[PDB]
């Protein structure tokens, strides 16, 4: 409109005036070390990359020998490193670096430097650097400098004059505002801070954040919570108003809101209506946000929505829309403009002047240590202008550099678009809605194949939603209004019931009965197999196609019921909501990814090039399968090796587990919603003493699907070798046979990261995964910090029922797995030593202890025998030779996962420790389908992998057809003849 | 010469003035043979069609096939052309006695007669199906016989042609009047370059005779020529019939212009006339087997013997007609083309060569292109029809052959008479015209290799291929009476218990002895396996594929050599040797690329932060137990694929082969193969045979032979013993009971003689060979009397001497076992045929064909592996089906049918691993017919194929989070929001 363009012309103007009144930010001063540093990671990416992981591994390379091979691992030798480039050269200069942008590395320090900052002009807010959070003696560490730092701050600003301003109170700064200004995580103060939980992490965040505040109000000071990422952004609101809504008459209470979120439109608007009809006032540090990177990835990750805008332009026009709203609403919220940009801080002054809001509603932040300029600037020209300032330990001080490297040497940073790549300053104080405009516009001007989507995986639950937060107590509460029920055998599309009963009950609660399961005798075995050899002819003549047809619409029926499979499982077996929900979604994901790889391999593809010949290489189904299935993953292994041999057009005797029957009944009512035809999926659970080997002895079976232990998989194979009178063909065996998967800790790791991921990788669906990490062999100077974390992790978590989303662990899965796998905790305390054995709760319930024992070598039962249970070893490697070694010395290759960031002991992890799926820094579970197609060799399986694009053939038989198509001395020329054309 | 050029241009424009815009009957479209072909030419799924229909037409003899062929190959009334039953049957029977002169010789000698009072001379020819044996080269020539009776008592009272001068009793004052063309290779069934002489002699001792009786008559004798395979026969044929009667002027022979031999082919038979001082006759023409030349060649990686681009067979034309009328002294000749162009050449160089016109005649087709013969007629006078004559079931072969002809893109009829094409093109000097399209023409390999294409087979159209053998065979006779000793570790070691290995054909001669490994040697080889494996896995794959390829060139520089040990050995046939061992190159050559192509690991995912690769692991040591009857290629095969993929092998040939194992060790040791990567220790199943497959160390077993031994191995591989570090994987190929079925319409002449070396190649000793021969009731009779009486012309002996079809199985334990199954079948059926054999000493079998045999029966359920064929009669072809698919296995089988409705039936319910249409069952080549099956003939792994190699490996998954500090490196195939 008219209106926006003279507005625009006096940002314009403004930004040219502040350009004009400056000269480079130290950090693009290319003189420096770190300018040059800076000035080649900005012209070579592939430099970037290796500088900044060596700032952030710096911290950990505590020795000489880490230092040097790191040194070279990372630059090369002298040779190939740039002109500016050892550990003196280096050291000094990565140190100086992280000391720009920290007032000091102990409280003391920082206060008299904070003073000094004041006598230039400068006000403060102040935050204290952390290694993450692990556990509550690391979040009262945090807190009690909080403390620690306001009982100093409280000594010292009686003597501090109030920064000028042009009147009000001269011992406030500018007249009005409080010296005192801290800045608090939210996060660091518990450690399982997750929206899964979302009651109990508002809770333990708000009551250390309250003791902070009461300090804070004692001082007449500042508070400001700090926002983080958005898994926690919905967490960190709720603190904020409970704790406004505590102390409704205290204003120095800040927030911070992020602009580059989609949502904080939205959640602005929100807060001013719920600020105005509580009668209260706010304030609020608008920042773009600090995530981006981890956001759009995170999200893409997990098939969510990503929440950030993804054109730089749009976090710029929504930060100037979002800081109008608030000056709008000055009379209610206090605004602080947190930016290094010089057009959005000039759009923010004219706003300002616009609107005509008083000055005691809105100051200016930068970053303490960069935009010096824009620093410089808005001292002369606003005059209220506070630093955030971080102060602490250099371990932390590292990663907060390597963060600060990368927002200033970003592409589309607006510091490096001035400072650095000469941009032309009309593009730079552009109105960024018209840069979002052409920018969309030029973007307006992976596919699938058949008409059907790419293959994606099925979006994990999203506890940042309201609604998914609900839906687990709304759907088992669902659940448990039908249980009772007696579920029978289905042959050949009938219901058969028969007289032999076994109850199947609430592992958490033995004494909630959910059902009552039919056991198949060997006579209903063997109509289901007569019924699935019946079937079998014309569903192996069905086009595959039409046979992918029908696990496309069993996946809409199981998607279409996620929430309720899941909460079966949450009580039939014990299942986390987190993981009962990645149990059907794996499920899905199998349904949409084997119709798919049917599809491809479905087609006949002629192969040689010979003229007058046509041969056709193509597939053909073997006959009946028997498919054993396990407990752990009671829908998704199911069905996805019933779906399997489904699709590639054999016809399934399927016998779920004893003790998660009725998860396998939703087999029953998944395949016949997507009506397919009766006999090609047979319902047998029953006894193994009775009808086990039955069933893997009989003629009419062609293969046997299992997965389940080591012990019963190898007597499987070896019965199911023999070829009987009237048995079509040699048995195909598809077995997958456990584990007992180690993680590395390598000096260098990452412990904020590894702590957790291991804790997660062990106790996770109280370690009842093929994939659960049982060992965890950490390096020899390592080993006592690590195990210390880790110990005081385990020790916040709680054991209890899975239904209850605060428990991290609960309940195994029935009798006889508690009292096995309490046999195996007794043996391993006797061979190492206990470091953790958690509180359990009283009365019923399968309750085996969160157990760690140390001291575990190669040698003892601990390190070599699957326990399937919440029992973790910890082993101490003296090298990593020896580290690998260890790792190798199992009878199983299932899983591993080594933390580390040494290039040379990566490479080699890769190369040596030879397991099916190797996982580099994170976790060692959950794996999903198409990106980590699971399975092993050695006694772990044979060589099958489930979820991927070898998987399908191991159900099929190749076949060829060859035809003379020449006549009288004539061939049609086909395509792809070799001729003489 | 532009001059002549210029003559001959004119002359074609006369040419073609004087014919009127008159169309050939072909292409006359007011006529139902013309509409036909009208549709056929705009439609080629229509010409498809079409001519497969008459070609399968004679054998529709019953009512029933007929409809249901109609329907089958044209779709209902509704979905016809308008110029389309019985008016079908009829068309097409007309259009058959369009080409031919008669069906009778009694009615061919009257319509000559008619011929000659229009002004035509004639060259008679013989319609026959193919000759497959005795009896039929027998009927054939007699046929002949008969025909030359009759026109010895017409032709005394036929006028002379009227000619410018000479005698006249004679056409045209010197051509004979009786004049017939005879095809060689309808004189012997076996007619084959492999055996020369053999081939040869047999025709040769038939012409002898018909030549006979034509010079009795005073008349001409022309030698047609045939394919290539037997041009080199044919000549020598010719050459020695030339020389037993020197003196006698009419005698000739056809020579090929498309042929790029043919230059000098026509300069070597022109001076040895001149060298001999005889006299010649060639009738030139371009030739008929154009597309079948190119496919055989291209099916065989041999070099392509026609030329490929069709002005290059107008231009060797003129070219070579030019040579002959230079040469009208010693070299009559017969210009035998329908093109004008051609004509007008041959008829303006002899002008412009004052050629008398005694030394040159012009031929055609009966009943074809026939205002071009009325035009030579017309300016030349002297034009002679080529006149097939005799029953309708070969007539509607050769016209199926003529409608190709004419038909064709590049035939001159069509673009004459069809396209309206350009007279100045059509007349263009044909050099110009290959100069144009040579200019106008002015499968890829990945990193740096050539693509995959099999290895040529041995060419016995080659005087030095031919003479190869007998030299090589030789050579290895020179290296008898060596001792092999075991290899391990990149050592020998001897043990002392040797057993001799010696000739089946002649077990008298002993070949060499062998050492056996004890348990004690197997375990030393296990462990130097295992020993060497963490090195070799961790070779990169290039370099790996790089020593299979070395051992690929080493073999193909000693082809002829290895093969000549196997025909000593184990008693192969020289082409049998031979394809033995090119197909070992193959594995070596293919595998090679199949590591290379799975060698790198791949992103699997698309996810940021993220890098998952997928890529495969080797597996240990892996015990390769090889069979005899495939000595080289399936050792070999199963060896290399286990050594490129990062595994090392433990290998155990059979102990009648063992010479040829060694073959492995020298290929491997002058490729340079780490030590222990490969180690030979043959032994004695019955010491080490459990102990190699039990033992902990062993992750993979590779198994070709019998099902009883297949399914020990699978049943004992299958326990974990302690120590053991996997689920050992079986690659098992276990043999077959393999059927062909002989449909009501198959073409029996193709039929016969794929199902005769389906059985009997390499004395049936295959595990791929035909035992089961599945013969439709109404074809039964005629099928297997034929099948028969082409088995009593082979002859049975040592495989060193290539006139014998097959010889003696592997050893004395073979021979009692199939003996004595042929006498558990004689006692089943009833014997059809039992060949005689070599007296004295070689394990010899008869070639045994018996019949009445059932599903019920054991020769139709238990492998022989053996000459023993069975035949069974199905009462209809759903009973074919059912009985083919009546045994415990499913490894090949075969269908001879031109049904489309039951071709579709086979490809779905004949579920054998591999299935052939139309051609025998055995022979698969690498990637072209990957091989193995299911049932009880293996656990469904196919050597050759792009399935094969991932058996050998285990897949391996890393996956690496790339995030630090909240930053990720971007990635090509990332899913991200640019
Ligand atoms: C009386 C007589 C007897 C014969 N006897 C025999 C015989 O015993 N053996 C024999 O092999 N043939 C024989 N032929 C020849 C054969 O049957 C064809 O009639 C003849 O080749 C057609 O040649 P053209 O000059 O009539 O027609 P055109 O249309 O001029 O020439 C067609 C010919 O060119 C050749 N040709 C087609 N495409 C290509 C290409 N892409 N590249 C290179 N060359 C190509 C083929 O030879 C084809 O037949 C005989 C022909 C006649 C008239």
Same mark, same amino acid.
């Given at each position: 409109?008219?209106?926006?363009?003279?507005?625009?012309?006096?940002?314009?103007?403004?930004?040219?005036?502040?350009?004009?009144?400056?000269?480079?930010?130290?950090?693009?001063?290319?003189?420096?070390?770190?300018?040059?540093?800076?000035?080649?990671?900005?012209?070579?990416?592939?430099?970037?990359?290796?500088?900044?992981?060596?700032?952030?591994?710096?911290?950990?390379?505590?020795?000489?020998?880490?230092?040097?091979?790191?040194?070279?691992?990372?630059?090369?030798?002298?040779?190939?490193?740039?002109?500016?480039?050892?550990?003196?050269?280096?050291?000094?200069?990565?140190?100086?670096?992280?000391?720009?942008?920290?007032?000091?590395?102990?409280?003391?320090?920082?206060?008299?430097?904070?003073?000094?900052?004041?006598?230039?002009?400068?006000?403060?807010?102040?935050?204290?650097?952390?290694?993450?959070?692990?556990?509550?003696?690391?979040?009262?560490?945090?807190?009690?400098?909080?403390?620690?730092?306001?009982?100093?701050?409280?000594?010292?600003?009686?003597?501090?004059?109030?920064?000028?301003?042009?009147?009000?109170?001269?011992?406030?700064?500018?007249?009005?505002?409080?010296?005192?200004?801290?800045?608090?995580?939210?996060?660091?103060?518990?450690?399982?801070?997750?929206?899964?939980?979302?009651?109990?992490?508002?809770?333990?965040?708000?009551?250390?954040?309250?003791?902070?505040?009461?300090?804070?109000?004692?001082?007449?000071?500042?508070?400001?919570?700090?926002?983080?990422?958005?898994?926690?952004?919905?967490?960190?609101?709720?603190?904020?108003?409970?704790?406004?809504?505590?102390?409704?008459?205290?204003?120095?209470?800040?927030?911070?809101?992020?602009?580059?979120?989609?949502?904080?439109?939205?959640?602005?608007?929100?807060?001013?209506?719920?600020?105005?009809?509580?009668?209260?006032?706010?304030?609020?540090?608008?920042?773009?946000?600090?995530?981006?990177?981890?956001?759009?990835?995170?999200?893409?990750?997990?098939?969510?929505?990503?929440?950030?805008?993804?054109?730089?332009?749009?976090?710029?026009?929504?930060?100037?829309?979002?800081?109008?709203?608030?000056?709008?609403?000055?009379?209610?919220?206090?605004?602080?403009?947190?930016?290094?940009?010089?057009?959005?801080?000039?759009?923010?002054?004219?706003?300002?002047?616009?609107?005509?809001?008083?000055?005691?509603?809105?100051?200016?932040?930068?970053?303490?240590?960069?935009?010096?300029?824009?620093?410089?600037?808005?001292?002369?020209?606003?005059?209220?202008?506070?630093?955030?300032?971080?102060?602490?330990?250099?371990?932390?001080?590292?990663?907060?550099?390597?963060?600060?490297?990368?927002?200033?040497?970003?592409?589309?940073?607006?510091?490096?678009?001035?400072? %650095?790549?000469? $941009?032309?300053?009309? @593009? /730079?104080? #552009?109105?960024? &809605?018209?840069? *979002?405009?052409?920018?969309?516009?030029?973007?307006?001007?992976?596919?699938?194949?058949?008409?059907?989507?790419?293959?994606?995986?099925?979006?994990?639950?999203?506890?940042?939603?309201?609604?998914?937060?609900?839906?687990?107590?709304?759907?088992?509460?669902?659940?448990?209004?039908?249980?009772?029920?007696?579920?029978?055998?289905?042959?050949?599309?009938?219901?058969?019931?028969?007289?032999?009963?076994?109850?199947?009950?609430?592992?958490?609660?033995?004494?909630?009965?959910?059902?009552?399961?039919?056991?198949?005798?060997?006579?209903?075995?063997?109509?289901?197999?007569?019924?699935?050899?019946?079937?079998?002819?014309?569903?192996?003549?069905?086009?595959?196609?039409?046979?992918?047809?029908?696990?496309?619409? %069993?996946?809409? $029926?199981?998607?279409? @019921? /996620?929430? #309720?499979?899941? &909460?079966?499982? *949450?009580?039939?077996?014990?299942?986390?909501?987190?993981?009962?929900?990645?149990?059907?979604?794996?499920?899905?994901?199998?349904?949409?990814?084997?119709?798919?790889?049917?599809?491809?391999?479905?087609?006949?593809?002629?192969?040689?090039?010979?003229?007058?010949?046509?041969?056709?290489?193509?597939?053909?189904?073997?006959?009946?399968?028997?498919?054993?299935?396990?407990?752990?993953?009671?829908?998704?292994?199911?069905?996805?090796?019933?779906?399997?041999?489904?699709?590639?057009?054999?016809?399934?005797?399927?016998?779920?587990?004893?003790?998660?029957?009725?998860?396998?009944?939703?087999?029953?009512?998944?395949?016949?919603?997507?009506?397919?035809?009766?006999?090609?999926?047979?319902?047998?659970?029953?006894?193994?003493?009775?009808?086990?080997?039955?069933?893997?002895?009989?003629?009419?079976?062609?293969?046997?699907?299992?997965?389940?232990?080591?012990?019963?998989?190898?007597?499987?194979?070896?019965?199911?070798?023999?070829?009987?009178?009237?048995?079509?063909?040699?048995?195909?065996?598809?077995?997958?046979?456990?584990?007992?998967?180690?993680?590395?800790?390598?000096?260098?790791?990452?412990?904020?990261?590894?702590?957790?991921?291991?804790?997660?990788?062990?106790?996770?669906?109280?370690?009842?995964?093929?994939?659960?990490?049982?060992?965890?062999?950490?390096?020899?100077?390592?080993?006592?910090?690590?195990?210390?974390?880790?110990?005081?992790?385990?020790?916040?978590?709680?054991?209890?029922?899975?239904?209850?989303?605060?428990?991290?662990?609960?309940?195994?899965?029935?009798?006889?797995?508690?009292?096995?796998?309490?046999?195996?905790?007794?043996?391993?305390?006797?061979?190492?030593?206990?470091?953790?054995?958690?509180?359990?709760?009283?009365?019923?319930?399968?309750?085996?202890?969160?157990?760690?024992?140390?001291?575990?070598?190669?040698?003892?039962?601990?390190?070599?025998?699957?326990?399937?249970?919440?029992?973790?070893?910890?082993?101490?490697?003296?090298?990593?030779?020896?580290?690998?070694?260890?790792?190798?010395?199992?009878?199983?290759?299932?899983?591993?996962?080594?933390?580390?960031?040494?290039?040379?002991?990566?490479?080699?992890?890769?190369?040596?420790?030879?397991?099916?799926?190797?996982?580099?820094?994170?976790?060692?579970?959950?794996?999903?389908?198409?990106?980590?197609?699971?399975?092993?060799?050695?006694?772990?399986?044979?060589?099958?992998?489930?979820?991927?694009?070898?998987?399908?053939?191991?159900?099929?038989?190749?076949?060829?057809?060859?035809?003379?198509?020449?006549?009288?001395?004539?061939?049609?020329?086909?395509?792809?003849?070799?001729?003489?054309?």
């Amino acid at each position: 409109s008219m209106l926006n363009s003279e507005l625009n012309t006096k940002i314009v103007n403004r930004g040219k005036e502040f350009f004009g009144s400056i000269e480079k930010p130290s950090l693009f001063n290319k003189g420096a070390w770190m300018g040059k540093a800076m000035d080649w990671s900005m012209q070579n990416e592939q430099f970037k990359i290796q500088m900044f992981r060596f700032v952030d591994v710096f911290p950990s390379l505590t020795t000489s020998k880490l230092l040097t091979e790191h040194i070279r691992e990372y630059f090369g030798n002298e040779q190939d490193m740039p002109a500016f480039m050892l550990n003196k050269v280096l050291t000094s200069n990565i140190e100086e670096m992280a000391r720009q942008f920290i007032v000091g590395e102990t409280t003391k320090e920082a206060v008299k430097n904070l003073e000094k900052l004041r006598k230039d002009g400068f006000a403060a807010v102040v935050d204290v650097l952390g290694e993450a959070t692990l556990s509550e003696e690391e979040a009262e560490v945090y807190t009690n400098t909080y403390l620690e730092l306001l009982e100093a701050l409280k000594k010292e600003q009686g003597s501090w004059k109030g920064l000028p301003g042009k009147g009000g109170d001269p011992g406030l700064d500018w007249g009005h505002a409080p010296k005192v200004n801290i800045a608090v995580k939210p996060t660091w103060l518990f450690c399982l801070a997750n929206p899964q939980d979302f009651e109990g992490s508002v809770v333990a965040i708000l009551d250390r954040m309250r003791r902070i505040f009461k300090k804070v109000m004692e001082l007449n000071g500042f508070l400001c919570i700090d926002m983080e990422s958005y898994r926690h952004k919905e967490i960190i609101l709720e603190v904020f108003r409970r704790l406004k809504l505590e102390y409704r008459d205290y204003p120095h209470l800040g927030i911070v809101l992020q602009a580059y979120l989609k949502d904080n439109d939205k959640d602005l608007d929100d807060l001013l209506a719920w600020a105005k009809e509580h009668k209260v006032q706010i304030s609020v540090r608008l920042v773009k946000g600090a995530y981006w990177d981890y956001e759009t990835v995170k999200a893409k990750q997990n098939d969510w929505e990503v929440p950030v805008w993804t054109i730089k332009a749009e976090s710029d026009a929504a930060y100037e829309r979002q800081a109008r709203k608030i000056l709008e609403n000055h009379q209610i919220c206090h605004f602080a403009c947190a930016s290094h940009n010089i057009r959005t801080i000039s759009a923010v002054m004219e706003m300002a002047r616009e609107l005509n809001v008083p000055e005691d509603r809105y100051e200016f932040q930068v970053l303490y240590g960069m935009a010096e300029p824009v620093r410089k600037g808005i001292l002369k020209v606003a005059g209220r202008i506070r630093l955030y300032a971080p102060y602490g330990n250099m371990v932390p001080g590292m990663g907060y550099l390597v963060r600060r490297l990368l927002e200033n040497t970003a592409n589309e940073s607006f510091l490096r678009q001035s400072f %650095a790549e000469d $941009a032309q300053i009309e @593009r /730079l104080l #552009e109105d960024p &809605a018209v840069t *979002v405009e052409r920018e969309r516009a030029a973007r307006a001007a992976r596919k699938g194949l058949g008409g059907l989507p790419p293959f994606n995986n099925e979006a994990m639950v999203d506890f940042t939603r309201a609604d998914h937060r609900a839906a687990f107590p709304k759907h088992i509460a669902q659940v448990r209004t039908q249980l009772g029920k007696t579920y029978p055998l289905f042959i050949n599309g009938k219901e058969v019931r028969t007289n032999d009963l076994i109850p199947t009950v609430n592992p958490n609660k033995p004494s909630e009965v959910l059902g009552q399961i039919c056991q198949a005798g060997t006579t209903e075995v063997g109509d289901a197999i007569a019924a699935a050899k019946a079937a079998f002819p014309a569903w192996r003549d069905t086009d595959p196609r039409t046979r992918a047809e029908y696990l496309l619409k %069993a996946a809409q $029926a199981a998607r279409k @019921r /996620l929430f #309720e499979l899941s &909460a079966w499982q *949450v009580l039939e077996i014990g299942k986390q909501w987190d993981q009962a929900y990645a149990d059907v979604t794996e499920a899905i994901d199998f349904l949409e990814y084997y119709a798919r790889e049917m599809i491809r391999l479905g087609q006949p593809q002629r192969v040689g090039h010979a003229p007058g010949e046509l041969n056709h290489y193509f597939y053909e189904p073997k006959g009946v399968a028997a498919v054993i299935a396990p407990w752990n993953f009671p829908l998704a292994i199911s069905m996805g090796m019933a779906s399997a041999a489904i699709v590639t057009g054999n016809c399934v005797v399927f016998k779920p587990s004893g003790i998660t029957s009725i998860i396998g009944w939703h087999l029953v009512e998944l395949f016949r919603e997507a009506g397919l035809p009766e006999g090609v999926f047979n319902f047998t659970p029953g006894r193994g003493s009775v009808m086990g080997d039955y069933l893997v002895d009989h003629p009419d079976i062609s293969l046997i699907a299992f997965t389940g232990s080591m012990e019963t998989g190898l007597r499987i194979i070896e019965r199911a070798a023999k070829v009987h009178p009237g048995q079509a063909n040699v048995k195909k065996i598809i077995s997958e046979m456990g584990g007992k998967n180690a993680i590395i800790i390598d000096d260098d790791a990452d412990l904020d990261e590894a702590v957790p991921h291991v804790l997660y990788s062990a106790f996770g669906f109280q370690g009842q995964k093929c994939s659960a990490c049982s060992r965890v062999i950490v390096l020899d100077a390592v080993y006592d910090k690590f195990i210390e974390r880790l110990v005081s992790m385990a020790k916040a978590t709680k054991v209890g029922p899975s239904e209850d989303p605060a428990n991290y662990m609960g309940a195994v899965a029935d009798d006889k797995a508690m009292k096995s796998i309490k046999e195996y905790a007794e043996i391993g305390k006797r061979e190492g030593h206990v470091l953790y054995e958690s509180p359990v709760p009283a009365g019923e319930g399968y309750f085996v202890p969160m157990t760690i024992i140390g001291g575990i070598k190669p040698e003892h039962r601990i390190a070599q025998e699957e326990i399937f249970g919440p029992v973790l070893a910890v082993m101490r490697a003296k090298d990593f030779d020896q580290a690998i070694e260890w790792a190798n010395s199992t009878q199983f290759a299932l899983t591993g996962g080594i933390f580390s960031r040494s290039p040379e002991h990566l490479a080699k992890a890769r190369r040596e420790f030879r397991v099916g799926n190797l996982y580099i820094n994170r976790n060692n579970t959950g794996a999903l389908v198409e990106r980590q197609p699971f399975g092993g060799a050695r006694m772990s399986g044979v060589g099958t992998k489930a979820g991927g694009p070898d998987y399908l053939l191991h159900f099929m038989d190749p076949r060829v057809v060859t035809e003379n198509t020449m006549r009288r001395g004539f061939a049609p020329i086909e395509e792809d003849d070799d001729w003489v054309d």
